[PDB]
């Protein structure tokens, strides 16, 4: 029997929020040590990998491994019934045909139980993470969110360019252009509003603006965003969770 | 001459709010003791009955009975010009071709007068209320509003099921299901957040979700909603006013 | 070299806000003493004239006259990247093919530079302002905004009628009508919530509601709106700036 209870029903919405705007159906592999889920969009340029440690829950028990794939369109709907902060509990049994989503408020006088029809879905799980990435930077997810949204106003191509201690986001549009140059530093009022950067090799990569706009959905999960870039390999955008994370592997343009 | 002055122009909007989302044109029968209005949607499954006592107004005078039907689409527009809390006064004269809507703010420096073209509309007035209903429950309009909206996410059929001291709202969708079970009790911090229930006979009725979503429009009028259910007859959803009320007679599915 | 720095990037948005909803492309004539810009909609019934004095800026330098026309659709986009209050600086050089828009926040750690492709656009500049207008009134831009929006709910024709110490806005719709009568007076709690009126000759003019709705866009620029009316000539709607203004010349209907 599976019983995964999020303390605050909100974060389960926010994580499937990063999924739904691109990927469609997705296998959630639940095992004793937590949940992992992976999905890839149609064009196979964006790959979303989730990991939820047991410490991210209020309570978690999984007697044995249970893979439960499901339509995020249908799931999200049940997550609309979820008014935020209602101890959402995922419940399933051995070889289940359905998953139960159970909400509960502070006052016991209200409790709602929902059920979601599951799917049989093959999935060739991927493991494309590199050992080392040419560059690695950390910045506020709100800042990165802004940069993407603003430069997205122009052409549908944003070009990240990293030289030593210099990160440069550029969009060159048909109507005009825009460039945001930020630099690594250290804050103290809130050290987690600062910018970090480790550069083994400089990078000059272009990404589809459409997808960068979808990657920043996860900015509601963490204060920071972890971007790892490689010239030959897809970029790793990561939003860290209390235990585990939400990753977005994006392939840069060929050009 | 007719002169019906609502103290706060808002509530006249809110009551025609319950109408407009379904019914079209509607005769407002004005007489010495107040206003009554009745309308039925196209499919004749929803009937909306209004009653406004004189105490619901700031001032009210109707020298003799005057029936004034009017298009709610056109009326609502004039009620958009009404910025909330502006002593809305309905004015008409003997055998009138038009009704005058008169707004006024705290500061005399602003006063707006509007006129609405009336209609000649036959209406076979209905009186389908039963003497006794198999079950009768009272709950917060906000709670009932939530239950409908959430279960409406699934299939377009919500099934209310009442056994002794057990009210059960269920929606069984193609993608999944949902069930909210509430029970009668008594609160004291706010006794009008509690749940009441008188059960002469148990009921198992299904209603079109579309209409239940329209019935909960009136939740802006009262803290509570009065639901009376009968197996053979249409259900009575009622939002009580200071004097008078707003009722929704809904026919359950045949199944 | 041109360097026009608005203290608060917001007001440059708000002024092109009055333009964009009607006019398309527009020459911004920049010279030593400030900026002027003029544009006319397709039907040639609305003419928008802008003037920005040097005192409206934080800093301003224009070594010599430079006319820079540009698409407001494209400009507005770059002004979306502008988060309010970011010292927007317009930068250009001799005979420029592009204009640079430069944002900057309180904290130096963020600075964004954008570029907008300019256009070659002929413009026969107009000077249709009369010496004297039959009537001239001043009222709160918020009040005038309300009157237009409300009476716009009815027919697409609003008729302003001014007799001595009596301003009367009337819309006579197919469904119904509405009339707002205001009078000149003097306040003291806030003397700039009052109503002024100088009447040399009475006027009875009708204006297209579509355009009056576009003229009130500028209500975000000033507390008051200056309306000058003439029977034979187009009306002058003006929102005063710290230095300079934003004018809307509207031609009344022939009828």
Numbering used by the authors:
A (entry chain A), B (entry chain A), C (entry chain A): 1 to 255
Quote the authors verbatim.
Proliferating cell nuclear antigen (PCNA) is a protein that is essential for many DNA metabolic processes including DNA replication, base excision repair, nucleotide excision repair, mismatch repair, and recombination. PCNA is a ring-shaped homo-trimer that acts as a sliding clamp that encircles DNA forming a scaffold for binding numerous proteins involved in DNA metabolism. PCNA is required for translesion synthesis (TLS), which is a pathway for bypassing DNA damage during replication. The subunit interface of PCNA is comprised of two anti-parallel β strands: strand I1 (residues 109 to 117) in domain 1 of one subunit and strand D2 (residues 175 to 183) in domain 2 of the adjacent subunit.
To better understand the role of the subunit interface in translesion synthesis and in other DNA metabolic processes, we used random mutagenesis to generate a series of PCNA mutant proteins with substitutions in either of these two β strands. We first measured the growth rate of these 17 strains in liquid media. Twelve of these strains (A112G, Y114F, S115E, S115G, S115V, S177G, S177L, S177V, G178L, G178M, S178T, and V180A) had slower growth rates than the wild type strain of approximately 4 to 5 hours. The remaining five strains had growth rates similar to the wild type strain of approximately 2 to 3 hours. We next measured the UV sensitivity of these 17 strains. All 17 strains had increased sensitivities to UV radiation to some extent compared to the wild type except G178M. We then examined the rates of spontaneous mutagenesis and the rates of UV-induced mutagenesis of these 17 strains as well as E113G and G178S. By contrast, all 17 strains, except the S177G, S179A, and V180A mutant strains, had statistically significant defects in the rate of UV-induced mutagenesis (with p values less than 0.05). Five of these strains (S115N, S177V, S179R, S179T, and I181R) had complete defects in UV-induced mutagenesis similar to that observed with the K164R control strain. A defect in UV-induced mutagenesis is a characteristic indicator of a defect in error-prone TLS.
